[PDB]
């Protein structure tokens, strides 16, 4: 028994009110599912906005080389698609939201509100999320390490 011997094989204005408080929203807190997560030192209320998925826009084709980039330094395991047209990166320079994990009871979903500068992934709330509850979103595209009630223990 050894793993060593085995080889390793109205919306816009309130949204900008949320944009004026990104230091004030949260701090980078942990979660014992895997490493970090995101907690809050406050109670995130109903219809409270949280975060926007920003970063580096991939074109239509550049993901076909970004998948080769994933084999050097193992850089991005943090993916979320913009659309059929584009993908947004958060690994070289961009959004620091690359530590929003997932449990099979996710407390947030993905919504799109479009500015003049294009479609933007916008997060709001639908309930009073209390202090210290991990924010995590459903994927809908490796088993989990959360230990949740009525948990699928998968990704999507």
């Amino acid at each position: 028994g050894s793993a060593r011997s085995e080889p390793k094989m109205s919306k816009s204005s309130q949204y900008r009110k949320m944009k004026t408080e990104w230091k004030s929203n949260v701090y980078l807190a942990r979660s014992r599912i895997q490493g970090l997560g995101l907690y809050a030192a406050r109670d995130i209320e109903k219809h409270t906005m949280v975060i926007e998925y920003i970063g580096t826009i991939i074109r239509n084709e550049v993901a076909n080389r970004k998948e080769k980039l994933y084999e050097s330094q193992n850089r991005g395991v943090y993916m979320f698609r913009m659309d059929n047209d584009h993908v947004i990166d958060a690994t070289l320079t961009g959004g620091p939201a690359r530590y929003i994990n997932h449990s099979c009871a996710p407390n947030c979903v993905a919504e799109v509100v479009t500015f003049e500068r294009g479609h933007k992934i916008i997060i709001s709330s639908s309930r009073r999320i209390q202090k210290g509850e991990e924010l995590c979103y459903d994927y809908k595209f490796i088993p989990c390490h959360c230990g949740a009630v009525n948990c699928r223990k998968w990704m999507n």
Binding site: S2, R4, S5, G35, S72, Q73, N74
Partner: protein
């Protein structure tokens, strides 16, 4: 450079995982995953006593000032606090949920780190043993824990080349180091000053990484390390020497400035899992896995 074979340490039921010498020339036990720690010797293979009674295989065992006090990083998700002349379970460390890969007593002999894979890494007390902190040690499973010359810094290895020098008093590491490879790093360690860390980049090029700049000093050649676990050693007995482990039934002993192939020593029958070094004399062991089941001592 005419390092010659002296002894042979056989008598194993499973594969041998590690050799780690005593700090002042005392002992070298069978630190293996065979549910066995036989207290073998470093000078002539002097068999002392039998300390066993485990549930599963030990990834690596810790060491002490008198080379006696142990703690088992076995694969049964548990850790007992061991003593040589006791044979008794003192307490039990709980807080892991996967393979307990590695655990250490610091050179001040007052800490028990215990490395994990799903980042359930907890730094423990030697005396009490109370649950303190889960640590986000990497984004990957941990493959090395080590304490430096004095005992305020903790280096840890990753599966993408993170040389995170974790702080003991606070818990926030300082500097992030990187390479253009995507290296599943099997092992990192400190130095006799704590400034140069030898990581594992798996294209037959292992690099000795700087503290502040994160550069390498001298990138070696001629070695074989692409999949299998191989330790990292240095020698201060005479002049400058570079000793490492191999895979092709050889013993890797070289010098730092050369970066050449000047000495390789046949005599093994398996991938060398482990070598180690001694501070005052050139007493060097060389362990291997299940296809050898021996630990061959070397001496100039």
């Amino acid at each position: 450079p005419n390092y010659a074979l002296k002894f042979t340490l056989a008598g194993h039921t499973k594969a041998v995982s590690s050799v780690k010498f005593s700090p002042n020339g005392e002992w070298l036990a069978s630190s293996s995953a065979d549910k066995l720690i036989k207290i073998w010797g470093a000078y002539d293979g002097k068999f002392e006593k039998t300390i066993s009674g485990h549930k599963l295989g030990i990834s690596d065992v810790a060491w002490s000032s008198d080379s006696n006090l142990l703690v088992s990083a076995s694969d049964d998700k548990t850790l007992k606090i061991w003593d040589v002349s006791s044979g008794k379970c003192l307490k039990t460390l709980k807080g892991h949920s996967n393979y307990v890969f590695c655990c250490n007593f610091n050179p001040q002999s007052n800490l028990i780190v215990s490395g994990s894979f799903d980042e359930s890494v907890r730094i423990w007390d030697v005396k009490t043993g109370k649950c303190l902190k889960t640590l986000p040690a990497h984004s990957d499973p941990v493959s090395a824990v080590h304490f430096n010359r004095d005992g305020s810094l903790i280096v840890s290895s990753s599966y993408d080349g993170l040389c995170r020098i974790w702080d003991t008093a606070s818990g926030q590491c300082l500097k992030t180091l990187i390479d253009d490879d995507n290296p599943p790093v099997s092992f990192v360690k400190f130095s006799p000053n704590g400034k140069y860390i030898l990581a594992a980049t798996l294209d037959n090029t292992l690099k000795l990484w700087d503290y502040s700049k994160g550069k390498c000093l001298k990138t070696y050649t001629g070695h074989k390390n692409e999949k299998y676990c191989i330790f990292a050693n240095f020698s201060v007995t005479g002049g400058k020497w570079i000793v490492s482990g191999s895979e092709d039934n050889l013993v890797y002993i070289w010098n730092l400035q050369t970066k050449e192939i000047v000495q390789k020593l046949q005599g093994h029958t398996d991938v060398v899992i482990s070598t180690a070094c001694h501070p005052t004399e050139n007493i060097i062991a060389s362990a291997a896995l299940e296809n050898d089941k021996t630990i061959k001592l070397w001496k100039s």
